[PDB]
Amino acid sequence: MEVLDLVTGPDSVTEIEAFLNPRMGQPPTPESLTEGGQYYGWSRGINLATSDTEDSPGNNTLPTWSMAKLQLPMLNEDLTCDTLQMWEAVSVKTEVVGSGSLLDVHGFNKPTDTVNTKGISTPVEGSQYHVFAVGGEPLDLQGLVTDARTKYKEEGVVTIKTITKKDMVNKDQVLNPISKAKLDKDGMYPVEIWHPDPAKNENTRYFGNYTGGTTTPPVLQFTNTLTTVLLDENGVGPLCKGEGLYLSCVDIMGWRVTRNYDVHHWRGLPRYFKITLRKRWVK
Amino acid sequence: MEVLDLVTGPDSVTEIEAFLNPRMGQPPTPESLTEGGQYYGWSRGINLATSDTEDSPGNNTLPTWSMAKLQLPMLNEDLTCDTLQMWEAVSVKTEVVGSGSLLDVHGFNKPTDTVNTKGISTPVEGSQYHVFAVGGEPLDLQGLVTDARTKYKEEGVVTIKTITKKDMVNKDQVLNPISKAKLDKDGMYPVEIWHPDPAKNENTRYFGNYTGGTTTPPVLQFTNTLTTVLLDENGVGPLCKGEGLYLSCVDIMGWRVTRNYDVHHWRGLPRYFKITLRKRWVK
Amino acid sequence: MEVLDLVTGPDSVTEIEAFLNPRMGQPPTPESLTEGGQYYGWSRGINLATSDTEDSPGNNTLPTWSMAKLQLPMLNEDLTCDTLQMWEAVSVKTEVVGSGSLLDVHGFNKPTDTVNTKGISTPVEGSQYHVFAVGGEPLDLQGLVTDARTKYKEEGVVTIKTITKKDMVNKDQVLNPISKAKLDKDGMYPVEIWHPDPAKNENTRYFGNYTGGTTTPPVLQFTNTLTTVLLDENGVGPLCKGEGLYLSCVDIMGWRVTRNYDVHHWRGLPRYFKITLRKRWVK
Amino acid sequence: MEVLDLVTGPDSVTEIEAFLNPRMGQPPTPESLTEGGQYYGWSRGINLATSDTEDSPGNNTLPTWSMAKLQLPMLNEDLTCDTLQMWEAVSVKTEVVGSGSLLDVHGFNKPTDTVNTKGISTPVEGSQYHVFAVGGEPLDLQGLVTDARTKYKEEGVVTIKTITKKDMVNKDQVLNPISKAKLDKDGMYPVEIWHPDPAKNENTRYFGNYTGGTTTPPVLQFTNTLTTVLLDENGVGPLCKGEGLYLSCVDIMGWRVTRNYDVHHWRGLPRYFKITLRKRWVK
């Protein structure tokens, strides 16, 4: 994989836009605002372990990674040609949209004055997690969990056991090299299990940040004036191997809590991506 | 829209100033300090949903975007001339004025010692939201709400339903591309519904930040020594299409809470804008 | 030790990768998720002093330093040659993996609603400590403890007494030059005792940060796009004396607390290291 | 006002030093530590509104701006000379002195253990406000209050009514261009009313920051190694019109609270200024 000069001429540079909607737990359908669709953009009620050895989170309570594989313009006539062209992601403008909606404090969440059930509807608060990646192949994931004893559903989610065909081991609570996967499905890989693998991702740039806590104030900036350069130390950005551009993200704002038993629901927001790509000559 | 050289000569550069007052809910009139006017700069008492399916916020409890369209000096004799001139916004000095007024802790808000009704009058705290934009056309808005079931008044505010003529759908809690609008009216577009659209705003620069929480300390800096460059990666700033310069903003400092049922009122502060514009030759 | 030119030619530059798993107290074995292995990645329950003069922490309740000594490619034929080559660490990409696992709030920890035993499983919070070092010899440690009267176990951990053969002195609560050691064993040197020695470490670069508190929200960033330059003011990086590269770290995220007597367990996460090394001519 | 070259030669550059003591409410005299003087550097007890329409803060409970007008060396023989010289403020080293005094937690304030009246004397906490300005004329102020109904004393303080001769209007809770003043007296303009006017102050540089909250920890840095450049985008600093250099500031650290009814007293600290000035030729 020799990377040569930038290709010049008509259409050697292109822009790709996309928004990835969050995957907090409640699927996009049913759309009915009375049959579950009113939780889209949120997780369903987080259910807790019933004992130290009985922790089975429902799939719709586990935020998962969002991902999209975008198709770029075709490039090579001759595939047996000594020198071909590849799309190179140069930079990305990305933005999490909707933080202002968090200013709705007039709903029916747990109120701030619980003695009289007054005040305001408590806004979303808590743990936040923002990660996005742009690469030329799926984001490589390293699994690591809080508890290797957690009983994740066998269906509907991709967990470490889905990959290894075996039960998690104690090493899965730290770095177990065996527990790897690729983010190749949207809404299926729980973010409390799968993390960007720093030992791989040679062709993907990822950026994440985590803020913990139970009532931590969410903080978010948004501007259309910032660009993230995806070029590495050698001036080379992610190269689209099959002309497939991979976008990955997760944007958890925290939880809203209901007036019944403090049931928490994760809140996620959509992320916008505008990727600038250029053609690169490759040998 | 070919952008050419900067125009030189007498009056090729100009400065425009404006302050946009906040739109927190209580309109500017009545002015009477006994008939409602005493709430100008604040929202009226935030009223809460009465059930999970009955959330009808009053219009005067919903901060909305502030916007102004400023007229710039006329430019072109010949409109059928191959090369015309356009005003280009180069930079802006902007400032949110009045945070010092938040130091009044001698009023009648909920006191800090509630056992004896003593201490100080609790100052403004909570969720903060600061956004401003400068562009050559209205700020493009993407709607996204906390709850697609919220029953916003049909009159007095522009909501997603005003635009689509239909009820919100579950997709409106995430990114629904159909829910778009333009900030073309001051005090009408609620900020908990309408967000800068990152997929558009090619000719507008916007910058916002959100801090959540219920008692989060407001933080604010102000100096007349800072400038925000509005030029893009190509050195081109927003171009005033009809010589109309659009200013948009929202500056929520948090809430003050009364001594009756913890009623919260949003507090907003005015924003000052000093935009430097230059004439640009356009083909 | 005269440092000359960089060696050029085939294989003069090399990359080395490694992940160091945390050493919070529970060893890697037994692996059994019922015999202790379920605490791997965590410390065992923190036990408190029984009086002002009886403080005997269990070894498995004390996070210790992680360290690894990596073997690099051999270099010198002639050891009696006027000019030899040495491996020089130029830079390191390092990352603490797994913060997303902290988003599991569905387990059996102390719940956020203790009155009804509801809400969510409190996530990991508290004191955080992140330190990593890359050097050409073991990290030099300076001992300093909260209490020189603490009765650390004599076996299983390397403490100041292990080194001095005598009991700690009051000076061990501040800087006592006599209390020095080298981080030459993984999982043995408690981080509450051993700190990077600023008076030594001429051939090691270390970087640490501490955040205290009992419920402080853990914060962590991770990206594969950042590099830490290890070169000193003279453009020289750590030199691998016996071609042994030393990696050291500790990454405490805070504690989880159980539903029984608020027993706290430290949580640590693995750290990834990708070190770029180049050959240097030395006289 | 044409600004020409910098004047060169003997004494063309000069330094001016000054410290402005805080104006929190209690005047410098009486000096008696039993007759009120013990509150100098603090405000007197903050008294609260007795109803929604009765808010009469005492003057000594309202921090006001500190300001000093310094006389610089005389400059011009000939005032009818085509080209004169003016003093130009180039930069300032400024510092808020005394934060370490906030480490006195052995006094008689509300204690941290209120059940037994033990622990420590609660240190100053809360809302902080730091602003300083250096200009060639008085700082231009824009009035904006929390409540236009507040009954400020007519004597002893300069309020919006002092300036307009009329009662405040609802517009005074937002930006009302009529409510302007100049900071031309020390200890008279309340900071909860008067803010730097961004629409004016062409010849003054101001910098401020606000942190709200009721128990927010005060934060402060101090070093003698930092300089603030006062030069504008054209390399011109404030010009001293009548060779009078204006220094303005306010530095509120928060409040201390007593053991009786949680009475709060604002704490302010003095600010030091070292201004470097140079002579400028003006046409």
């Binding site: 950026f207 940040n209 501007t223 004036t225 | 800072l226 460059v229 | 402080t216 991770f222 | -």
Partner: peptide, 29 residues
């Protein structure tokens, strides 16, 4: 305080100090 953000959270914008304006400007005319 203790709740940071510096990656995936749409990042911080800056401003230019007035006196630095020409330079910064001269690069985009």
């Amino acid at each position: 305080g203790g709740g940071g953000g510096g990656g995936g959270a749409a990042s911080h914008q800056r401003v230019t100090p007035d006196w630095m304006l020409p330079l910064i400007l001269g690069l985009y005319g």
